[PDB]
Amino acid sequence: KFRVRNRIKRTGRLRLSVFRSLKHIYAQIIDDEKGVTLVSASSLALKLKGNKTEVARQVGRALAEKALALGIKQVAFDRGPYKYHGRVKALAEGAREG
Amino acid sequence: RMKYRKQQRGRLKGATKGGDYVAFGDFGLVALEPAWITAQQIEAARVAMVRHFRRGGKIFIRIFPDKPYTKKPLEVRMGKGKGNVEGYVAVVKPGRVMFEVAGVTEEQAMEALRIAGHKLPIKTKIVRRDAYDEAQ
Amino acid sequence: MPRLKVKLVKSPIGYPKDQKAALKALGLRRLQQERVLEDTPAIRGNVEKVAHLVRVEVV
């Protein structure tokens, strides 16, 4: 399953591969047509505490700082076979809130 | 048989795929010229083959007719021919192996295949066996 | 690219259009005509396709 993924691929640039673990929640700004990650704010495998949801909000804010630094803004999010509602929600939620 | 009504004429190019090797039996019968062999020509050779040596061994007919032979009832040009008159035929090209006997002597086969040669339109040859297969 | 003497000997009458156009690109008029051209890759290909009509020479 990855229909959505392919939809965004042809869309444009600066994908946001939000692969989450059962407890972790990684996030990478991969740009296709070359395959290169930019802002890769990891979660549990980075520094943050232990609270998947609230941890997601912050790790999202982590992308914002690093991203706004490199002059990026295209919010080409990547659901990555995940329903927008819980953890993945806070991801783009916090990242776009700033 | 079974498939559907009519088929094209088509030409008979090189004696390529129309040719093989003694795949069964001891002796065999090979065509020297191209031609469509009729269902009757087959039955003619077959019956004459077994009728020669009574209670004979086993006769293998490798070829097989399936091409509808078209023909018009002595008139003119309305639509395609009804065909089927002579029945069917097989794309026999030089080198091919029509008949081949087995479990029998050499004289019976030598005569029977010779006889079954006249039953066929094409000038033919009779091959023994050799050992030409495909191995090591 | 050495010189290439090419003499016409076989009348193009009865041969396909392309071949005729070939001898035009080579500039061949009447029979038994002389024509010294370079040995360039293209010029070769044309004289080749009409080799049965003309006798090539290496000068």
Partner: protein, 76 residues
């Protein structure tokens, strides 16, 4: 009999070829279904028509499982 019949020619297939310059909108290739997929700067319509979205050159890219893609590399 009752056979003499045939819809006239639709004249499909590859229209544009690789190494060809093109304007903006040129129907690169007409097709029956998905004998060819879109690609970089290449859109399609209902009849599965392939056409440029930008200006550049046509290029073909076979990819086995995925299929045969066609795109136009922009330049000026």
């Amino acid at each position: 009999t009752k056979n003499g019949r045939d819809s006239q020619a639709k004249r499909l297939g590859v229209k544009r070829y690789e190494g060809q310059v093109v304007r903006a909108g040129n129907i690169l290739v007409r097709q029956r279904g998905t004998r060819f997929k879109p690609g970089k700067n290449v859109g399609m319509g209902r009849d599965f028509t392939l056409f440029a979205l930008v200006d550049g050159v046509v290029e073909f890219q076979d990819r086995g499982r995925l299929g045969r893609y066609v795109h136009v590399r922009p330049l000026a």
